[PDB]
Amino acid sequence: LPDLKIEKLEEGVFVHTSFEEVNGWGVVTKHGLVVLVNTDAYLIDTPFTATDTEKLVNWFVERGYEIKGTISSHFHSDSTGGIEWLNSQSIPTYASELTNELLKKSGKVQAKYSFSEVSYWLVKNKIEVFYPGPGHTQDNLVVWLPESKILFGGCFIKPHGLGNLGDANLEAWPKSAKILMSKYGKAKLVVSSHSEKGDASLMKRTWEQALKGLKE
Ligand SMILES: C[C@@H]1[C@H]([C@H](C(=O)O)[C@@H](C)O)N=C(C(=O)O)[C@H]1S[C@@H]1CN[C@H](C(=O)N(C)C)C1
Ligand SMILES: [Zn+2]
Ligand SMILES: [Zn+2]
């Protein structure tokens, strides 16, 4: 029931938070990002709903910013919910090829654009996209802001319990978390889908929870 929130983290980085009841887990709080590169604005994951997605886009346009693209970090609706409404607005939506396949196979609107990298610049020297391996899902990826050393980990960062296991890969998640820890050990801030922002140790905690959950 709470409203969409938009808070500023540092210059150029905003967390958007949206809320949705999902059967069993109760009310889910979902964090995403909005990254500004001069007057360009990029959505890192969409809010749950078209409504909130529209509200978030209007909030930044009305302040003089151009929405230039969006990328979903994985296929579940807490990252993809607003894709359809953005397509109907010719706002470019991005997802990996696997994520669009998983959106396909389960009957949901796909992002307009597919890519197949494991690491690349979404915006050169500004926003990096990285796939550490399967974890929370087979397609989950992260986004890295080298200039603020902030990392968006999505639903892969689980410092207090792994969450929905339905599409997760328990065997791989520890190794993926180790790879993530080595890549981004220099992070100063780690934003996740559902936990409070923290420092680089959230990645260690995630590895521990991935390990505990494999063991059962
Ligand atoms: C229902 C959510 C959502 C779902 C998912 O991606 O699996 C879907 C609605 O988008 N993402 C989710 C996830 O585990 O990452 C789920 S579970 C819920 C999220 N915050 C809670 C949590 O993280 N705990 C450690 C208890 C539980
Ligand atoms: Zn998910
Ligand atoms: Zn989630």
Residue numbers in the entry: 4 to 219
Q: What text comes from the article?
A:
In complex with each of the hydrolyzed carbapenems, this loop forms a tightly locked, tunnel-like structure around the hydrolyzed antibiotic, with several hydrophobic interactions appearing to stabilize this state. The sulfur atom present in the linker region (S-10) of all carbapenems creates strong π-sulfur interactions with the aromatic ring of Trp28 (as well as interacting with the backbone of Asn167), thereby contributing to the position of the core scaffold of all presented carbapenem substrates. The pyrrolidine ring of meropenem, doripenem, and ertapenem is suitably located to form aromatic, π-alkyl interactions with His197 and is further stabilized by the hydrophobic environment created by Val25 and Val31. The terminal nitromethyl group of meropenem is stabilized by direct as well as water-mediated interactions with the backbone of His163 and Gly164 and π-alkyl interactions with Trp28. In the X-ray structures, the interaction of bound ertapenem and meropenem with the Trp28 side chain occurs via the sulfur adjacent to the β-lactam ring and, additionally, via the methyl group on the pyrroline ring. Further description focuses on chain B of the doripenem-, ertapenem-, and imipenem-bound structures and chain A of the meropenem-bound structure, where crystal packing is not seen to affect ligand placement. The lower root mean squared fluctuations (RMSFs) for heavy atoms of L1 residues in the simulated doripenem-, ertapenem-, and meropenem-bound complex structures than for those of the apoclosed structure indicate that L1 is more rigid in the closed conformation when these ligands are bound, while in the apo protein, L1 can move with a higher degree of freedom. Nevertheless, it is clear from the MD simulations that differences in antibiotic structure affect the restriction of the L1 loop, with the doripenem, ertapenem, and meropenem complexes showing the greatest restriction in L1 loop mobility.
IMP-13, a member of subgroup 2, sharing 92.3% amino acid sequence similarity with IMP-2 and 82.5% with IMP-1, was first identified in the Gram-negative pathogen Pseudomonas aeruginosa from clinical samples in Italy and is a common cause of carbapenem resistance, often involved in large outbreaks. Imipenemases represent one of the major groups of class B1 metallo-β-lactamases found in Gram-negative pathogens, and these enzymes can hydrolyze all bicyclic β-lactam antibiotics. The overall protein architecture of the IMP-13 apo structure is consistent with that of the previously published metallo-β-lactamase fold, consisting of a global αβ/βα topology with a shallow active-site cleft at the border of the two β-sheets. The structural information and dynamics presented here reveal important information about the mechanism of antibiotic binding, as well as a significant role for the active-site-covering loop (L1), indicating that the plasticity of the active-site region is important for the broad substrate recognition spectrum of these enzymes.
